Design a protein around this nucleic acid. Structure first.
Ligand SMILES: [Mg+2]
Ligand SMILES: [Mg+2]
Ligand SMILES: [Mg+2]
Ligand SMILES: [Mg+2]
Ligand SMILES: [Mg+2]
Ligand SMILES: [Mg+2]
Ligand SMILES: [Mg+2]
Ligand SMILES: [Mg+2]
Ligand SMILES: [Mg+2]
Ligand SMILES: [Mg+2]
Lengths: 31, 63, 50, 50, 59, 107
RNA sequence: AGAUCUUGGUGGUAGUAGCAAAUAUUCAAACGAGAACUUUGAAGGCCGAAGUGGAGAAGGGUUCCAUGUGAACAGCAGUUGA
RNA sequence: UCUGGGUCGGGGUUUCGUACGUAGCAGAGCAGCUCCCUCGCUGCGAUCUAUUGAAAGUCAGCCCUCGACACAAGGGUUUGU
Protein backbone atom coordinates (compact mmCIF):
# COMPACT_ATOMS: atom_id res chain seq x y z
CA UNK A 1 0.00 0.00 0.00
CA UNK A 2 1.00 3.65 -0.40
CA UNK A 3 1.70 6.12 2.40
CA UNK A 4 3.18 9.61 2.33
CA UNK A 5 6.77 8.43 2.77
CA UNK A 6 6.42 5.87 -0.03
CA UNK A 7 4.74 8.34 -2.41
CA UNK A 8 7.31 11.13 -2.01
CA UNK A 9 10.16 8.81 -2.97
CA UNK A 10 8.16 7.01 -5.67
CA UNK A 11 7.99 10.27 -7.62
CA UNK A 12 11.77 10.10 -7.97
CA UNK A 13 12.16 6.60 -9.38
CA UNK A 14 9.39 6.89 -11.97
CA UNK A 15 11.05 10.02 -13.43
CA UNK A 16 13.99 8.91 -15.58
CA UNK A 17 14.25 12.14 -17.57
CA UNK A 18 13.11 15.69 -18.03
CA UNK A 19 9.82 16.99 -19.34
CA UNK A 20 8.65 15.12 -22.42
CA UNK A 21 10.13 11.69 -21.68
CA UNK A 22 8.25 8.49 -20.90
CA UNK A 23 7.85 7.49 -17.28
CA UNK A 24 9.38 4.36 -15.81
CA UNK A 25 6.84 1.56 -15.59
CA UNK A 26 8.41 -0.89 -13.13
CA UNK A 27 11.59 -2.03 -11.42
CA UNK A 28 11.06 -5.62 -10.28
CA UNK A 29 13.69 -7.90 -8.76
CA UNK A 30 13.20 -11.66 -9.02
CA UNK A 31 15.71 -14.42 -8.33
CA UNK B 1 31.60 -1.19 -15.46
CA UNK B 2 31.60 -1.13 -19.28
CA UNK B 3 28.25 -1.98 -20.86
CA UNK B 4 28.83 -1.88 -24.62
CA UNK B 5 27.91 -5.56 -25.05
CA UNK B 6 24.76 -5.10 -22.97
CA UNK B 7 23.62 -2.15 -25.08
CA UNK B 8 24.28 -4.08 -28.29
CA UNK B 9 22.38 -7.15 -27.08
CA UNK B 10 19.48 -5.06 -25.78
CA UNK B 11 19.27 -3.32 -29.16
CA UNK B 12 19.22 -6.70 -30.91
CA UNK B 13 16.55 -8.16 -28.61
CA UNK B 14 14.32 -5.07 -28.51
CA UNK B 15 14.58 -4.75 -32.33
CA UNK B 16 15.39 -1.05 -31.98
CA UNK B 17 18.54 0.98 -32.42
CA UNK B 18 21.00 1.73 -29.66
CA UNK B 19 19.40 5.19 -29.45
CA UNK B 20 16.26 3.76 -27.84
CA UNK B 21 18.01 1.35 -25.46
CA UNK B 22 17.81 2.60 -21.87
CA UNK B 23 19.95 0.87 -19.25
CA UNK B 24 19.27 1.60 -15.61
CA UNK B 25 22.05 3.91 -14.35
CA UNK B 26 21.58 2.63 -10.80
CA UNK B 27 21.54 -1.10 -11.62
CA UNK B 28 24.85 -1.03 -13.47
CA UNK B 29 26.14 -4.04 -11.53
CA UNK B 30 23.06 -6.16 -12.28
CA UNK B 31 23.15 -5.31 -15.99
CA UNK B 32 26.91 -5.96 -16.12
CA UNK B 33 26.20 -9.56 -15.07
CA UNK B 34 24.09 -10.01 -18.23
CA UNK B 35 26.20 -11.78 -20.85
CA UNK B 36 23.50 -13.65 -22.81
CA UNK B 37 20.32 -12.75 -24.64
CA UNK B 38 18.26 -14.77 -22.16
CA UNK B 39 19.60 -12.54 -19.39
CA UNK B 40 18.88 -9.47 -21.52
CA UNK B 41 15.31 -10.72 -21.96
CA UNK B 42 15.02 -11.26 -18.20
CA UNK B 43 16.28 -7.72 -17.54
CA UNK B 44 13.81 -6.30 -20.07
CA UNK B 45 11.02 -8.23 -18.34
CA UNK B 46 12.14 -7.03 -14.90
CA UNK B 47 12.19 -3.37 -15.96
CA UNK B 48 15.94 -2.70 -15.86
CA UNK B 49 16.09 -2.24 -19.65
CA UNK B 50 13.52 -0.06 -21.39
CA UNK B 51 12.89 0.81 -25.03
CA UNK B 52 12.69 4.59 -25.08
CA UNK B 53 9.75 6.05 -27.04
CA UNK B 54 10.20 7.44 -30.53
CA UNK B 55 11.20 11.11 -30.69
CA UNK B 56 8.14 13.21 -31.45
CA UNK B 57 7.81 14.54 -35.01
CA UNK B 58 4.35 16.09 -35.15
CA UNK B 59 2.45 16.86 -38.34
CA UNK B 60 -0.10 19.20 -36.74
CA UNK B 61 1.76 22.19 -38.19
CA UNK B 62 1.72 20.56 -41.63
CA UNK B 63 -1.99 19.75 -41.34
CA UNK C 1 51.90 84.32 -26.44
CA UNK C 2 51.50 87.30 -28.78
CA UNK C 3 49.42 85.91 -31.65
CA UNK C 4 45.76 86.86 -31.88
CA UNK C 5 44.85 83.20 -31.44
CA UNK C 6 46.35 83.63 -27.98
CA UNK C 7 45.36 86.44 -25.56
CA UNK C 8 41.81 86.26 -26.97
CA UNK C 9 39.03 86.57 -24.42
CA UNK C 10 36.80 83.48 -24.17
CA UNK C 11 33.13 83.91 -23.23
CA UNK C 12 31.05 80.73 -23.34
CA UNK C 13 27.37 80.88 -24.23
CA UNK C 14 26.45 77.21 -23.82
CA UNK C 15 28.01 74.00 -22.49
CA UNK C 16 26.60 70.72 -23.77
CA UNK C 17 25.66 68.29 -21.00
CA UNK C 18 23.70 65.73 -23.00
CA UNK C 19 24.32 62.09 -22.15
CA UNK C 20 27.52 60.84 -23.77
CA UNK C 21 26.52 57.22 -23.05
CA UNK C 22 24.57 57.12 -26.32
CA UNK C 23 22.82 59.77 -28.38
CA UNK C 24 21.84 61.93 -25.45
CA UNK C 25 19.19 64.51 -26.24
CA UNK C 26 18.31 66.19 -22.91
CA UNK C 27 20.57 68.63 -21.11
CA UNK C 28 19.25 68.02 -17.58
CA UNK C 29 17.10 65.69 -15.51
CA UNK C 30 14.42 68.36 -15.10
CA UNK C 31 14.21 69.14 -18.81
CA UNK C 32 13.82 65.43 -19.61
CA UNK C 33 11.07 65.06 -17.00
CA UNK C 34 9.26 68.18 -18.23
CA UNK C 35 9.41 66.90 -21.81
CA UNK C 36 8.42 63.29 -21.23
CA UNK C 37 6.02 63.90 -18.33
CA UNK C 38 5.13 61.14 -15.89
CA UNK C 39 6.00 57.54 -16.74
CA UNK C 40 4.75 54.15 -15.58
CA UNK C 41 7.39 53.77 -12.86
CA UNK C 42 6.54 57.26 -11.61
CA UNK C 43 2.89 56.16 -11.42
CA UNK C 44 3.69 52.98 -9.51
CA UNK C 45 5.93 54.90 -7.11
CA UNK C 46 3.25 57.56 -6.63
CA UNK C 47 0.54 55.01 -5.82
CA UNK C 48 2.80 53.63 -3.08
CA UNK C 49 3.56 57.18 -1.93
CA UNK C 50 -0.17 57.91 -1.50
CA UNK D 1 35.10 65.59 -23.53
CA UNK D 2 32.13 67.74 -24.47
CA UNK D 3 31.42 70.72 -26.71
CA UNK D 4 30.57 74.37 -26.17
CA UNK D 5 29.04 77.32 -28.01
CA UNK D 6 30.78 80.69 -27.99
CA UNK D 7 30.90 83.90 -29.99
CA UNK D 8 34.19 84.59 -31.75
CA UNK D 9 35.92 87.98 -31.56
CA UNK D 10 38.33 87.50 -34.48
CA UNK D 11 38.16 90.55 -36.78
CA UNK D 12 38.48 89.94 -40.50
CA UNK D 13 37.37 86.30 -40.18
CA UNK D 14 34.30 84.54 -41.52
CA UNK D 15 33.35 83.60 -37.96
CA UNK D 16 33.67 87.17 -36.65
CA UNK D 17 30.87 87.79 -34.13
CA UNK D 18 29.54 84.36 -35.18
CA UNK D 19 28.73 81.35 -33.03
CA UNK D 20 30.98 78.30 -33.18
CA UNK D 21 30.78 74.83 -31.67
CA UNK D 22 34.10 73.69 -30.24
CA UNK D 23 35.09 70.43 -28.60
CA UNK D 24 36.48 70.86 -25.09
CA UNK D 25 38.19 68.48 -22.69
CA UNK D 26 37.32 68.44 -18.99
CA UNK D 27 40.29 67.83 -16.68
CA UNK D 28 39.43 67.43 -13.00
CA UNK D 29 41.96 69.24 -10.80
CA UNK D 30 41.53 68.85 -7.05
CA UNK D 31 44.02 71.10 -5.25
CA UNK D 32 47.62 69.93 -4.95
CA UNK D 33 49.07 69.47 -1.47
CA UNK D 34 52.65 70.62 -0.90
CA UNK D 35 54.72 68.19 1.19
CA UNK D 36 58.35 68.95 0.35
CA UNK D 37 60.99 71.26 -1.08
CA UNK D 38 63.94 70.33 -3.31
CA UNK D 39 66.86 72.62 -4.10
CA UNK D 40 69.04 72.23 -7.18
CA UNK D 41 72.54 73.52 -7.84
CA UNK D 42 73.96 74.25 -11.28
CA UNK D 43 77.06 72.18 -12.02
CA UNK D 44 79.22 71.87 -15.16
CA UNK D 45 77.68 68.40 -15.40
CA UNK D 46 74.09 69.68 -15.25
CA UNK D 47 71.60 70.30 -12.49
CA UNK D 48 71.98 68.03 -9.49
CA UNK D 49 69.74 67.62 -6.46
CA UNK D 50 71.26 69.47 -3.51
CA UNK E 1 22.11 78.84 -27.13
CA UNK E 2 21.59 79.31 -30.87
CA UNK E 3 18.31 78.85 -32.74
CA UNK E 4 16.68 75.65 -31.53
CA UNK E 5 15.61 73.29 -34.30
CA UNK E 6 13.12 70.43 -34.45
CA UNK E 7 13.59 67.03 -36.06
CA UNK E 8 11.60 64.38 -37.92
CA UNK E 9 10.52 63.29 -34.43
CA UNK E 10 9.86 66.86 -33.28
CA UNK E 11 12.59 66.70 -30.63
CA UNK E 12 14.76 69.71 -29.92
CA UNK E 13 18.15 69.52 -31.65
CA UNK E 14 20.86 71.20 -29.62
CA UNK E 15 23.86 72.85 -31.31
CA UNK E 16 26.47 70.41 -32.52
CA UNK E 17 23.94 67.56 -32.63
CA UNK E 18 22.42 65.76 -35.58
CA UNK E 19 22.58 66.52 -39.27
CA UNK E 20 20.87 68.83 -41.75
CA UNK E 21 19.52 67.79 -45.14
CA UNK E 22 18.91 70.18 -48.04
CA UNK E 23 16.88 68.77 -50.92
CA UNK E 24 17.03 69.73 -54.57
CA UNK E 25 13.50 71.19 -54.49
CA UNK E 26 14.64 73.79 -51.93
CA UNK E 27 13.45 72.28 -48.64
CA UNK E 28 15.85 72.00 -45.70
CA UNK E 29 15.33 69.30 -43.08
CA UNK E 30 17.25 68.66 -39.88
CA UNK E 31 17.44 65.35 -38.00
CA UNK E 32 18.39 64.63 -34.41
CA UNK E 33 20.19 61.35 -35.12
CA UNK E 34 20.65 58.72 -37.82
CA UNK E 35 17.55 56.82 -36.67
CA UNK E 36 15.25 59.73 -37.49
CA UNK E 37 17.23 60.45 -40.66
CA UNK E 38 16.89 56.86 -41.86
CA UNK E 39 13.19 56.85 -41.00
CA UNK E 40 12.71 60.05 -43.01
CA UNK E 41 14.77 58.81 -45.97
CA UNK E 42 12.76 55.57 -46.10
CA UNK E 43 9.64 57.78 -46.37
CA UNK E 44 8.17 56.43 -43.14
CA UNK E 45 5.36 58.55 -41.76
CA UNK E 46 6.07 60.04 -38.31
CA UNK E 47 2.37 59.83 -37.39
CA UNK E 48 2.73 56.02 -37.32
CA UNK E 49 5.98 55.73 -35.32
CA UNK E 50 5.07 55.36 -31.67
CA UNK E 51 7.85 57.47 -30.13
CA UNK E 52 7.62 60.55 -32.37
CA UNK E 53 5.97 63.71 -31.09
CA UNK E 54 3.52 63.74 -34.01
CA UNK E 55 2.20 60.29 -33.08
CA UNK E 56 1.86 61.34 -29.44
CA UNK E 57 -0.19 64.41 -30.32
CA UNK E 58 -2.22 62.45 -32.87
CA UNK E 59 -3.21 59.87 -30.25
CA UNK F 1 28.52 27.61 10.88
CA UNK F 2 29.44 25.44 7.88
CA UNK F 3 26.29 23.55 6.78
CA UNK F 4 24.65 26.76 5.57
CA UNK F 5 22.63 26.98 2.36
CA UNK F 6 21.85 30.23 0.53
CA UNK F 7 20.02 31.36 -2.60
CA UNK F 8 21.91 33.60 -5.03
CA UNK F 9 21.18 35.03 -8.45
CA UNK F 10 24.03 35.11 -10.97
CA UNK F 11 24.43 37.59 -13.82
CA UNK F 12 25.39 35.05 -16.45
CA UNK F 13 25.16 37.80 -19.07
CA UNK F 14 27.81 39.79 -17.20
CA UNK F 15 30.21 36.83 -16.98
CA UNK F 16 29.74 35.49 -20.53
CA UNK F 17 30.02 38.82 -22.39
CA UNK F 18 32.55 38.70 -25.22
CA UNK F 19 32.74 34.88 -25.36
CA UNK F 20 32.29 33.19 -28.73
CA UNK F 21 29.14 31.35 -29.73
CA UNK F 22 30.43 27.78 -29.37
CA UNK F 23 31.80 28.56 -25.88
CA UNK F 24 29.05 30.47 -24.09
CA UNK F 25 27.33 27.61 -22.26
CA UNK F 26 30.54 25.78 -21.21
CA UNK F 27 31.90 29.10 -19.98
CA UNK F 28 28.59 29.60 -18.17
CA UNK F 29 29.15 26.32 -16.33
CA UNK F 30 32.75 27.30 -15.58
CA UNK F 31 31.72 30.71 -14.24
CA UNK F 32 28.96 29.13 -12.14
CA UNK F 33 31.54 26.79 -10.61
CA UNK F 34 33.95 29.69 -10.03
CA UNK F 35 31.16 31.74 -8.43
CA UNK F 36 30.36 28.86 -6.08
CA UNK F 37 34.04 28.44 -5.18
CA UNK F 38 34.30 32.15 -4.42
CA UNK F 39 31.07 32.42 -2.42
CA UNK F 40 31.41 29.28 -0.29
CA UNK F 41 35.20 28.84 -0.25
CA UNK F 42 34.99 25.18 -1.33
CA UNK F 43 37.07 23.88 -4.26
CA UNK F 44 34.75 20.86 -4.51
CA UNK F 45 31.65 22.19 -6.28
CA UNK F 46 28.98 19.82 -7.58
CA UNK F 47 26.45 21.13 -10.10
CA UNK F 48 22.99 19.58 -10.31
CA UNK F 49 21.99 18.09 -13.64
CA UNK F 50 18.82 20.19 -13.55
CA UNK F 51 21.01 23.29 -13.29
CA UNK F 52 23.08 22.13 -16.27
CA UNK F 53 19.87 21.46 -18.20
CA UNK F 54 18.62 24.95 -17.31
CA UNK F 55 21.83 26.62 -18.48
CA UNK F 56 21.79 24.63 -21.74
CA UNK F 57 18.03 25.15 -22.13
CA UNK F 58 18.33 27.63 -25.02
CA UNK F 59 21.26 26.02 -26.83
CA UNK F 60 24.97 26.67 -26.79
CA UNK F 61 24.99 30.42 -27.50
CA UNK F 62 21.72 31.95 -26.24
CA UNK F 63 22.49 31.37 -22.56
CA UNK F 64 19.99 32.94 -20.12
CA UNK F 65 21.06 36.34 -18.84
CA UNK F 66 20.26 35.65 -15.17
CA UNK F 67 19.72 32.48 -13.16
CA UNK F 68 18.62 31.83 -9.58
CA UNK F 69 20.69 29.11 -7.93
CA UNK F 70 20.98 27.67 -4.43
CA UNK F 71 24.44 27.06 -2.97
CA UNK F 72 24.37 24.37 -0.28
CA UNK F 73 27.55 23.69 1.68
CA UNK F 74 27.47 20.09 2.87
CA UNK F 75 29.61 17.68 4.85
CA UNK F 76 31.86 15.56 2.65
CA UNK F 77 32.57 13.32 5.66
CA UNK F 78 31.94 10.17 3.63
CA UNK F 79 35.46 8.88 2.89
CA UNK F 80 39.14 9.82 3.17
CA UNK F 81 39.14 12.98 1.04
CA UNK F 82 41.37 16.08 1.01
CA UNK F 83 38.30 18.34 1.21
CA UNK F 84 35.90 17.88 4.12
CA UNK F 85 33.30 20.25 2.63
CA UNK F 86 31.62 20.54 -0.76
CA UNK F 87 29.04 22.76 -2.44
CA UNK F 88 25.99 21.45 -4.29
CA UNK F 89 24.58 24.14 -6.57
CA UNK F 90 20.92 23.50 -7.41
CA UNK F 91 18.53 25.27 -9.75
CA UNK F 92 15.77 27.56 -8.46
CA UNK F 93 13.10 28.24 -11.11
CA UNK F 94 11.72 31.78 -10.87
CA UNK F 95 9.37 33.87 -12.98
CA UNK F 96 11.07 37.25 -12.55
CA UNK F 97 14.42 38.50 -11.28
CA UNK F 98 13.27 41.89 -10.00
CA UNK F 99 14.07 42.78 -6.37
CA UNK F 100 15.61 39.37 -5.63
CA UNK F 101 18.08 39.70 -2.76
CA UNK F 102 20.56 37.07 -1.65
CA UNK F 103 18.63 35.39 1.16
CA UNK F 104 19.55 32.72 3.68
CA UNK F 105 17.33 29.64 3.43
CA UNK F 106 16.78 27.17 6.27
CA UNK F 107 16.99 23.37 6.12
C1' A G 1 90.92 14.83 -42.60
C1' G G 2 88.93 15.35 -46.88
C1' A G 3 86.84 11.84 -52.34
C1' U G 4 78.38 16.06 -52.48
C1' C G 5 83.55 9.02 -49.98
C1' U G 6 80.97 3.62 -47.47
C1' U G 7 78.57 1.84 -42.98
C1' G G 8 77.33 2.87 -37.86
C1' G G 9 76.68 6.31 -33.96
C1' U G 10 75.83 11.53 -32.07
C1' G G 11 75.00 16.87 -31.73
C1' G G 12 73.29 22.29 -32.57
C1' U G 13 68.77 23.47 -34.65
C1' A G 14 65.23 22.42 -30.28
C1' G G 15 61.61 21.43 -25.96
C1' U G 16 61.66 24.66 -31.59
C1' A G 17 58.22 24.04 -36.16
C1' G G 18 54.30 21.97 -35.21
C1' C G 19 49.69 18.14 -33.10
C1' A G 20 44.23 24.59 -37.02
C1' A G 21 39.90 20.92 -43.74
C1' A G 22 34.55 18.97 -42.86
C1' U G 23 29.71 23.98 -36.50
C1' A G 24 30.08 21.11 -30.21
C1' U G 25 30.15 20.13 -26.37
C1' U G 26 28.16 20.15 -20.89
C1' C G 27 26.43 17.95 -16.03
C1' A G 28 26.15 13.75 -12.64
C1' A G 29 27.52 8.85 -11.43
C1' A G 30 30.22 3.95 -11.85
C1' C G 31 34.70 1.07 -12.35
C1' G G 32 39.43 2.43 -11.36
C1' A G 33 45.84 3.96 -8.05
C1' G G 34 44.89 7.38 -11.83
C1' A G 35 39.23 10.04 -16.08
C1' A G 36 38.74 16.27 -20.95
C1' C G 37 39.04 11.29 -23.98
C1' U G 38 36.15 4.48 -21.05
C1' U G 39 30.87 3.12 -19.56
C1' U G 40 25.67 4.53 -17.98
C1' G G 41 22.10 8.35 -17.46
C1' A G 42 20.44 13.57 -18.53
C1' A G 43 21.00 17.78 -21.82
C1' G G 44 22.72 20.51 -26.46
C1' G G 45 23.92 19.50 -31.39
C1' C G 46 25.41 17.00 -36.19
C1' C G 47 24.96 13.24 -40.50
C1' G G 48 19.28 14.58 -42.74
C1' A G 49 17.27 8.59 -46.86
C1' A G 50 22.21 11.21 -53.60
C1' G G 51 23.35 9.64 -44.88
C1' U G 52 28.29 9.93 -40.78
C1' G G 53 22.04 4.64 -41.88
C1' G G 54 21.26 -0.72 -43.38
C1' A G 55 23.67 -4.71 -46.80
C1' G G 56 26.96 -6.70 -50.84
C1' A G 57 31.17 -7.34 -55.16
C1' A G 58 36.79 -6.69 -55.68
C1' G G 59 40.60 -6.58 -52.16
C1' G G 60 42.16 -7.83 -46.97
C1' G G 61 42.64 -12.77 -44.04
C1' U G 62 40.90 -13.65 -38.63
C1' U G 63 40.88 -7.72 -38.40
C1' C G 64 34.74 -11.20 -36.33
C1' C G 65 33.20 -12.88 -30.70
C1' A G 66 34.15 -13.27 -25.39
C1' U G 67 37.68 -12.92 -21.40
C1' G G 68 42.22 -10.99 -19.46
C1' U G 69 46.76 -7.26 -19.60
C1' G G 70 48.35 -2.19 -19.43
C1' A G 71 55.33 -3.55 -21.54
C1' A G 72 55.35 -1.45 -26.62
C1' C G 73 51.68 0.80 -30.61
C1' A G 74 46.95 3.81 -31.37
C1' G G 75 52.18 11.23 -33.25
C1' C G 76 47.81 14.04 -25.84
C1' A G 77 45.69 10.45 -22.79
C1' G G 78 43.02 6.08 -21.96
C1' U G 79 40.31 2.06 -17.13
C1' U G 80 39.52 1.96 -24.33
C1' G G 81 41.21 -0.41 -28.92
C1' A G 82 41.14 -3.22 -35.71
C1' U H 1 39.96 52.97 9.57
C1' C H 2 36.17 57.77 10.59
C1' U H 3 36.38 49.93 7.76
C1' G H 4 37.22 48.03 2.81
C1' G H 5 36.34 45.56 -1.73
C1' G H 6 33.09 42.29 -3.98
C1' U H 7 28.05 39.85 -5.31
C1' C H 8 23.08 40.78 -5.97
C1' G H 9 19.15 44.41 -5.69
C1' G H 10 17.81 49.57 -6.58
C1' G H 11 18.06 54.30 -9.10
C1' G H 12 20.18 57.13 -13.29
C1' U H 13 21.62 57.02 -18.34
C1' U H 14 20.99 54.81 -22.88
C1' U H 15 19.32 51.15 -27.03
C1' C H 16 15.05 49.35 -29.49
C1' G H 17 10.12 50.62 -30.18
C1' U H 18 4.66 49.72 -27.35
C1' A H 19 5.48 43.07 -24.30
C1' C H 20 2.18 38.36 -22.31
C1' G H 21 -2.66 38.39 -20.81
C1' U H 22 -7.20 40.86 -20.68
C1' A H 23 -11.08 44.05 -22.80
C1' G H 24 -13.37 46.39 -27.07
C1' C H 25 -20.78 47.95 -30.62
C1' A H 26 -12.55 48.40 -33.95
C1' G H 27 -12.02 45.00 -37.93
C1' A H 28 -12.25 42.56 -44.96
C1' G H 29 -15.78 39.22 -44.20
C1' C H 30 -17.65 34.19 -43.08
C1' A H 31 -20.29 29.97 -40.32
C1' G H 32 -24.69 28.71 -36.79
C1' C H 33 -29.38 30.18 -33.48
C1' U H 34 -34.31 32.62 -33.99
C1' C H 35 -40.09 31.03 -27.73
C1' C H 36 -35.32 33.78 -28.04
C1' C H 37 -34.00 38.44 -30.87
C1' U H 38 -37.25 43.04 -33.84
C1' C H 39 -32.18 44.07 -34.77
C1' G H 40 -29.99 40.69 -32.00
C1' C H 41 -26.61 36.75 -29.99
C1' U H 42 -22.48 32.70 -30.49
C1' G H 43 -17.97 31.20 -32.88
C1' C H 44 -13.56 31.85 -36.79
C1' G H 45 -10.70 35.97 -38.46
C1' A H 46 -5.00 38.94 -40.41
C1' U H 47 -4.95 43.55 -38.37
C1' C H 48 -6.29 47.97 -34.87
C1' U H 49 -7.17 50.41 -30.13
C1' A H 50 -6.59 50.88 -24.40
C1' U H 51 -3.80 48.89 -20.50
C1' U H 52 1.54 50.70 -22.67
C1' G H 53 7.24 55.79 -24.49
C1' A H 54 5.16 49.78 -22.66
C1' A H 55 8.23 45.16 -22.47
C1' A H 56 13.42 43.78 -22.71
C1' G H 57 18.77 44.68 -22.27
C1' U H 58 22.28 48.02 -20.03
C1' C H 59 29.59 46.93 -17.98
C1' A H 60 31.20 42.53 -18.55
C1' G H 61 36.12 48.41 -19.50
C1' C H 62 28.79 53.31 -18.20
C1' C H 63 27.35 56.63 -13.52
C1' C H 64 25.40 56.80 -8.17
C1' U H 65 24.19 53.57 -4.16
C1' C H 66 24.53 52.65 1.53
C1' G H 67 19.27 48.22 0.70
C1' A H 68 20.58 42.68 1.29
C1' C H 69 24.40 38.85 1.60
C1' A H 70 28.68 36.72 2.75
C1' C H 71 33.87 37.73 2.84
C1' A H 72 38.10 40.02 4.18
C1' A H 73 44.77 41.10 9.60
C1' G H 74 45.42 35.61 5.20
C1' G H 75 48.98 32.08 2.18
C1' G H 76 54.12 31.36 -0.01
C1' U H 77 59.62 32.77 -1.53
C1' U H 78 63.50 35.86 -0.47
C1' U H 79 66.43 40.23 0.84
C1' G H 80 71.84 43.26 5.65
C1' U H 81 75.83 48.17 5.45
MG1 LIG I 1 29.41 58.52 -26.49
MG1 LIG J 1 87.78 9.51 -40.97
MG1 LIG K 1 54.98 25.41 -30.33
MG1 LIG L 1 48.09 24.01 -33.91
MG1 LIG M 1 18.90 19.53 -34.34
MG1 LIG N 1 20.58 18.91 -39.52
MG1 LIG O 1 26.22 2.76 -47.17
MG1 LIG P 1 36.23 -6.18 -31.93
MG1 LIG Q 1 49.96 8.33 -27.38
MG1 LIG R 1 21.94 47.81 -12.49
Amino acid sequence: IMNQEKLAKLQAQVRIGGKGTARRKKKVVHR
Amino acid sequence: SMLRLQKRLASSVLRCGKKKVWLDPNETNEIANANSRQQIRKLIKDGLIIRKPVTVHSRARCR
Amino acid sequence: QTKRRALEKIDLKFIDTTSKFGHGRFQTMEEKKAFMGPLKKDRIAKEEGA
Amino acid sequence: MTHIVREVDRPGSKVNKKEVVEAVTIVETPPMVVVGIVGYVETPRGLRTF
Amino acid sequence: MKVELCSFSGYKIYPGHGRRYARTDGKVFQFLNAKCESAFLSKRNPRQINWTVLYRRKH
Amino acid sequence: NEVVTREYTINIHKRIHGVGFKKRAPRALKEIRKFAMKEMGTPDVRIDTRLNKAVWAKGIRNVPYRIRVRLSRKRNEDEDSPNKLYTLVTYVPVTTFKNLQTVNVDE
